[PDB]
């Protein structure tokens, strides 16, 4: 339910259910503006949010929208010294792991699997507790009981967004930043060439 300036209640994939089309419209107190646009539409705002506005009507599903499509999962509160290999171990039983991105500054992780099914499996693996490695033979505080959600964030689309930001950058600064890049490669390889030579 997307309500920024225009509240849009949804029913199904296409115009299948469509029974609350005129109900809200002829609703005197609740809504003066009417519901259509291939889904139900108002330009109104009262004191509520979707949170309970759904059950306010209590007459339909109230599910655009996209889920169950993700080849990636997000993993939540993640202890300080975790590792990409530790995340790979912790999510190996879900499937073969393509990418892992550990954010300590956020204490989170992104696990790009190879298939949507593995991600769904690993949301079920939210129940499993954490252990960077080790075993359950010895018990301590190491069980962390992570949170796991699904992520629309993939290697390809991050590549695209990466270059999209690198070129939403200036047009003249990137090369002047590349002239800062090339002198770094040079001045680092400079005293490296002089390293083995002078010795």
């Amino acid at each position: 339910i997307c309500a920024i300036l225009i509240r849009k209640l949804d029913f199904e994939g296409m115009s299948h259910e469509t029974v609350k089309k005129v109900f809200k419209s002829c609703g005197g107190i609740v809504g003066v503006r009417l519901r259509h646009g291939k889904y139900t539409l108002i330009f109104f705002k009262s004191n509520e949010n979707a949170k309970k506005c759904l059950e306010f009507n209590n007459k339909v599903v109230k599910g655009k929208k996209r889920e169950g499509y993700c080849r990636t999962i997000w993993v939540g509160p993640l202890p300080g010294g975790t590792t990409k290999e530790q995340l790979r171990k912790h999510f190996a039983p879900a499937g073969q792991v393509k990418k892992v991105r550990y954010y300590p500054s956020k204490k989170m992780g992104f696990v790009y699997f190879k298939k949507a099914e593995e991600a769904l499996k690993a949301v079920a693996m939210q129940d499993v507790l954490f252990s960077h490695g080790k075993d359950v033979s010895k018990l301590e505080k190491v069980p962390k009981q992570l949170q796991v959600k699904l992520k629309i964030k993939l290697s390809r689309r991050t590549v695209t967004g990466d270059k999209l930001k690198r070129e939403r950058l200036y047009n003249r600064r990137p090369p002047s930043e590349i002239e800062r890049k090339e002198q770094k490669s040079a001045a680092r390889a400079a005293l490296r060439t002089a390293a083995k030579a002078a010795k």
Partner: protein, 35 residues
């Protein structure tokens, strides 16, 4: 909540205007130095 919300609103708006300018100035001069 009021002071913190208005501080975060300022950050959101200032950054938005700044990036608008970054993508406007240096994408105007993009095509004008192209042709």
């Amino acid at each position: 909540h009021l002071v913190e919300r208005r501080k975060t609103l300022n950050r959101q708006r200032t950054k938005a205007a700044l990036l608008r300018q970054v993508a406007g100035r240096r994408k105007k001069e993009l095509d004008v130095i192209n042709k």
